[PDB]
């Protein structure tokens, strides 16, 4: 009895795709062709940081644009200072695997989790003076992919099996669960205004959720390979994605279709981390060809080679105010470029 | 500079010296990894060396050489993305049961577990991240296989089998396929020790294998080849 239901589903998606095709009228490229080019840009290795002895996976800029947190496969978690290159704290962990870290907007909490299918929240401003484990969150039978903070009392995690959850810190419980994906979710980036977020999975599909109700608002599928990075524009209009098919694309929330495609023949590598610079003109991206590239948003063009590394680039971030960027690569280095 | 800046300097240098001490202390530990079908008695194998928590870890030391023992059984997800974390493993202890060629367990229309194990072993060994990592193979349990070969010819699972009803030639056949599954020859090697409820042997063989692989690695790193 699944054949008839399958055929109504097929015709429904067919007419939806037909409506999507009918909606589009023109491409953004020739509309924005008259935008003046930005020209070449040169960045420099203004500062360097060392002290790690192993791989580096993730980093996150603080809300005040002065503090930095970075993880490593070695069971250490060190907090840096952006300006004077001083070490502030060392956080010895229990499990020796980390794949994501987060920094609280109030500058009091940090989070870190990895393959142990466990989530740990830490407290910094303690009366005694030493960091201590606050609470342990368990219940996911899969490897975590990303942890983000919505406020000082809510934690959002993108699991590995089929789901993403919305925890609360007051009690070790679950407010709600989200289902609808088939593969494994890779990224989960919150929005500048806290009522929406998207979490693409390993099925070349991206679903946009609602924080309060809990229903799949939209659904997109245009890529051929896996999705590995997601980010938002400064406002709540558009977002851009990155795949393993040596290409990046961006969409629109209202238009619900594709807008531009980035492709250059010599590119054969993949995409690892993607972020948008402020003012919404420059889109940065770290590739797998030992290099990092910068592109123009409204025009398909290249501006420079932000690359002086010796291995793959793993984590990439941008300060809130916009003073500089950061690229933590596969080697045990970390360079701030301005 | 104000005094707070200097105080930050001493604090930073103390943290740095703590980090270097911890790194140099923890740099002299060897890492081992396990893989298998799941019904291979991996827990029992761990128990012999010993004498929802997806990753379980144990420590044991024999005659002053620290070993770290792993497990990746409890993931139940796609393997293509979480395998690159373990690029530093010195050796991999692959274990598979050989007597369970019959008694179809997964699906009646599907094939026996022998070919599934062969495909899994091929995928594990021929991956590009582990091009310079030795592989160690153990056979789980034997006496049951010995008492079943007498009542059933081995060719029931192997159409190209042409041997007699004797243990030694059929065994040599089995590790013949296990050996020639590989296609990258000089760098790696396989050992294929037979353990069946035998004490004092598994740890000794593991020690010999890890010493061999570590001395080969040091010789390669010293520019003698």
């Amino acid at each position: 009895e699944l054949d008839q239901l399958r055929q109504e589903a097929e015709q429904l998606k067919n007419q939806i795709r037909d409506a999507r095709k009918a909606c589009a009228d023109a491409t953004l490229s020739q509309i924005t062709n008259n935008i003046d080019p930005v020209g070449r840009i040169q960045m420099r290795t203004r500062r360097t940081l060392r002290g790690h002895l192993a791989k580096i996976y993730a980093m996150h800029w603080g809300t005040d644009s002065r503090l930095l947190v970075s993880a490593s496969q070695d069971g250490k978690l060190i907090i840096w200072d952006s300006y004077t290159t001083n070490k502030v704290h060392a956080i010895p962990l229990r499990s020796s695997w980390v794949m994501t870290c987060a920094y609280a907007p109030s500058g009091n909490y940090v989070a870190c989790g990895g393959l142990d299918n466990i989530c740990s929240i830490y407290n910094l401003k303690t009366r005694e003076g030493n960091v201590r484990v606050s609470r342990e969150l368990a219940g996911h039978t899969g490897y975590l992919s990303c942890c983000r903070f919505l406020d000082d009392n809510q934690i959002v995690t993108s699991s590995g099996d089929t789901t993403c959850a919305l925890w609360d810190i007051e009690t070790g419980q679950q407010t709600t669960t989200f289902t609808g994906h088939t593969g494994d979710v890779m990224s989960l980036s919150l929005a500048p205004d806290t009522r929406l977020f998207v979490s693409g999975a390993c099925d070349a599909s991206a679903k946009l959720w609602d924080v309060r109700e809990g229903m799949c608002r939209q659904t997109f599928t245009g890529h051929e390979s896996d999705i590995n990075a997601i980010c938002f524009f400064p406002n709540g209009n558009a977002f851009a994605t990155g795949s393993d098919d040596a290409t990046c694309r961006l969409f629109d929330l209202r238009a619900d279709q594709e807008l531009m495609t980035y492709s250059h023949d010599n590119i054969i590598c993949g995409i690892t981390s993607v972020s948008f610079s402020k003012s919404g003109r420059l889109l940065l991206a770290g590739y797998d060809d030992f290099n990092c590239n910068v592109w123009d948003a409204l025009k398909a063009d290249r501006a420079g080679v932000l690359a002086g590394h010796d291995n793959r680039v793993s984590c990439l971030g941008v300060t809130d105010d916009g003073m500089a960027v950061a690229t933590g690569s596969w080697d045990s280095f970390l360079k701030i470029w301005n | 500079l104000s005094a707070e800046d200097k105080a930050a300097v001493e604090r930073s240098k103390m943290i740095d010296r703590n980090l270097r001490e911890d790194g140099e202390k923890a740099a002299r530990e060897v890492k081992l990894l396990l893989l298998g079908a799941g019904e291979s008695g991996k827990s029992t194998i761990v128990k012999q060396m010993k004498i929802t928590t997806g990753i379980v870890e144990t420590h044991f030391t024999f005659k002053d050489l620290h070993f770290k023992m792993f497990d990746v059984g409890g993931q139940r997800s796609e393997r293509k993305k979480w395998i690159h974390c373990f690029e530093g493993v010195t050796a991999i202890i692959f274990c598979v049961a050989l007597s369970d060629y019959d008694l179809v367990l997964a699906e009646d229309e599907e094939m026996n577990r022998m070919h599934e194990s062969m495909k899994l072993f091929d995928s594990i060994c021929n991956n590009k991240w582990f091009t310079d990592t030795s592989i160690i193979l153990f056979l789980n349990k034997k006496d049951l296989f010995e008492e079943k070969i007498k009542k059933s010819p081995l060719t029931i699972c192997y159409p190209e089998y042409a041997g007699s009803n004797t243990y030694e030639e059929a065994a040599a056949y089995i590790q013949c396929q296990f050996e020639d599954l590989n296609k990258r020859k000089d760098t790696k090697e396989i050992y294929t020790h037979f353990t069946c409820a035998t004490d004092t042997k598994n740890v000794q063989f593991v020690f010999d294998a890890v010493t061999d692989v570590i001395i080969k690695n040091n010789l390669k790193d010293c520019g003698l080849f």
Partner: single-chain antibody
Amino acid sequence: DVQLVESGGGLVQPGGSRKLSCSASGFAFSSFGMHWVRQAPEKGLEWVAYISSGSGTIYYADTVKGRFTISRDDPKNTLFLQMTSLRSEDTAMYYCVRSIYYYGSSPFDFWGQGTTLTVSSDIVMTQATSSVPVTPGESVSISCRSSKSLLHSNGNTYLYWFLQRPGQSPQLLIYRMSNLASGVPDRFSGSGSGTAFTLTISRLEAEDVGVYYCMQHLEYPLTFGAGTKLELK
């Protein structure tokens, strides 16, 4: 808790030698630095010594530079002094102060209880006012002046505030200008620029009576303030 204990005391004839000790109660003694402070019987206070973690900086004062020494040991969490010969100016109150220095730190957090001992260039703090009658509730303004400008090239000031109820040890109120402390209400506040600085308070209550001090932390021989007494007629 973070409770501390002081031991040693009594009277000693001039030229005698003694030792004083302080004991820690579970606050990671091996990661924090600490001081000692002299409190005159009816006068202000003085700074006598300083040690830091790792036995790196062993600074002293400029009046007792030779007759005093400090020693610390990580196990058992204890800090020591040594005396050689005491004159009539050494009879005063002796204290203990804990201080940690990092980026977002608040030095001079907890103070001790103290013990009694009876023998039997430098920046100046003006604090011209000494006593000001106050009502049960009103706004009170307290001001102090310095010799050199406190503004450093970084862009942060280095003046502290304090309070002391009768018969009790002090506690921190403002660790840096326009930064409220930890464990105090929001009624207090402060503002200032250049060298002249002023403390302002919104409301009063019958627990704020005491004496207010003033610090400075640019040039290592810390020079204390004068002190202002409130009587609350």
